[PDB]
Amino acid sequence: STGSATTTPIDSLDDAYITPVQIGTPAQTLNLDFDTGSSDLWVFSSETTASEVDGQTIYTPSKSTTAKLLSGATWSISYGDGSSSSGDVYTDTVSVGGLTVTGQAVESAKKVSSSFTEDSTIDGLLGLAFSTLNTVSPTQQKTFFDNAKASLDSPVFTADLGYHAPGTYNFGFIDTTAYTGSITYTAVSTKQGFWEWTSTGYAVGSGTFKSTSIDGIADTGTTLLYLPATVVSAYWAQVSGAKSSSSVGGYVFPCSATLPSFTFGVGSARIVIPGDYIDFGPISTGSSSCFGGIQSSAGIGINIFGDVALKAAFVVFNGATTPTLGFASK
């Protein structure tokens, strides 16, 4: 089997992407944030505290003929940005892009934090990291990908995120029309539950490539590219008037700047992030200070190849017995 779904930016800045997901019988379609840095499939629901729902589409398990309470099971997640949610758990039929899993754990939110309430466009999360990170207790649950794997034509999914435009998540096959050149594969460590890999270095603009190992995670559910302070300083030093602002919470730069590209290494291959991908717009409406898309990972404890980086590539998440990542230009 395979599946193929379009993923769409939630706003003009590509702050996240939403992918329609069918849950239950008859189908209830919710728009989920596919997150390769978490392992929970959770949704706004008929159980979510009413004052915490503001425009989301909710899952109502009582309207699904296939919804089964996973009795006793609870979940609670805390994300890197400080946001959170928690609740109880139903198993139900879940389909993505024509690929169906029966008996998927669907984590129903009873509570969500303010960041989630205030984002009307995201109806929940679909985690695609390793199932060792799933938060369901007392019986940990599998991701949609782990449950689908055995049925897929190939044990893979691919992320092809758009730059100010829609893109695609495919399951079970690699669309050889969707990228240019060849795919370079690199080793993955699953020790922390993430798609963790080591970049071979970086370049800023037209500058020389610096060969240096950068451990980090391929994380579709993070907007920005978080790298070591040395690398980030070297990038922003090439932008006149850029500075790190403790008041704003990262590097800002004059909106009248043209940003240099950023290259990262994947083995002997190179992925080039165009400068305009690193523009995340005025810090507040009408400001002439713009927010940077490359930020320091100092204090986060891991480097994150988030959407700024991933949207410059066709990315293969190879879930074979020995997992690997692949990157191609596009």
Ligand X SMILES: CCOc1cccc(C(=N)N)c1
Tokens of 292: 């940077």
Q: How far is the CB of 194 from ligand X (least distance, A)?
A: 7
Could you give phi then psi for residue 230, rounded to 5 degrees? -60, -45
- Does the footprint of ligand X cover residue 33 (CB under 6 A)? yes
Site for ligand X in 230-269 (CB under 6 A): 255
Q: Which stretch binds ligand X (CB under 6 A): 115-123, 175-183, 227-235, 311-319?
A: 115-123
d(CA 68, CA 87): 15
Q: Which one of the listed residues 14, 35, 92, 160 is annotated catalytic?
A: 35
Q: Applying CB under 6 A, which of residues 281, 283, 289, 324 lies at the interface with ligand X?
A: 281
Residue length of the chain: 330
- Indicate which single residue of 78, 120, 230, 233 sits in contact with ligand X (rule: CB under 6 A): 78
Nearer to ligand X, 16 or 183 (CB): 16
Among 119, 123, 160, 196, binds ligand X (CB under 6 A): 119
Nearer to ligand X, 100 or 244 (CB): 244
Is residue 102 part of the contact set for ligand X (CB under 6 A)? no
Q: Which of 38, 108, 199, 297 is catalytic?
A: 199
| Closest CB 40 distance from ligand X, rounded Å | 9
Question: Where in 139-178 is the site for ligand X (CB under 6 A)?
Answer: none
Is residue 141 within 8 A of residue 131, CB to CB? The reply is yes
Tokens 């320091």 correspond to: 296
Is 35 in the active site? yes
189 binds ligand X (CB under 6 A): no
CB of 74 to ligand X, least distance (A): 18
Per-residue HEC secondary structure of 222-235 comes to CCCEEECHHHHHHH
Is 279 a residue that touches ligand X (CB under 6 A)? yes
Indicate the SS3 state at residue 55: coil
Of the candidates 173, 148, 144, the residue with the CA atom closest to the CA atom of residue 158: 173
Residue with tokens 């024509």: 98
The residue number whose beta carbon is nearest to ligand X equals 37
Cα–Cα nearest to 105, from 75, 65, 79: 75
Question: Measuring CA to CA, which residue among 162, 149, 167, 128 is closest to residue 34?
Answer: 128
Q: Which stretch binds ligand X (CB under 6 A): 72-80, 95-103, 160-168, 242-250?
A: 72-80
Alpha-carbon distances, residue 265 vs 45, 101, 214, 273, 326 (angstroms): 42, 36, 9, 11, 12
Q: Which of 249, 244, 248 lies closest to 232, judged by CA?
A: 244
Contacts with ligand X by CB under 6 A lie at: 16, 33, 35, 37-38, 78-81, 83, 115-116, 119, 122, 219, 221-222, 255, 279, 281-282, 290
Q: What is the set of active-site residues?
A: 35, 199
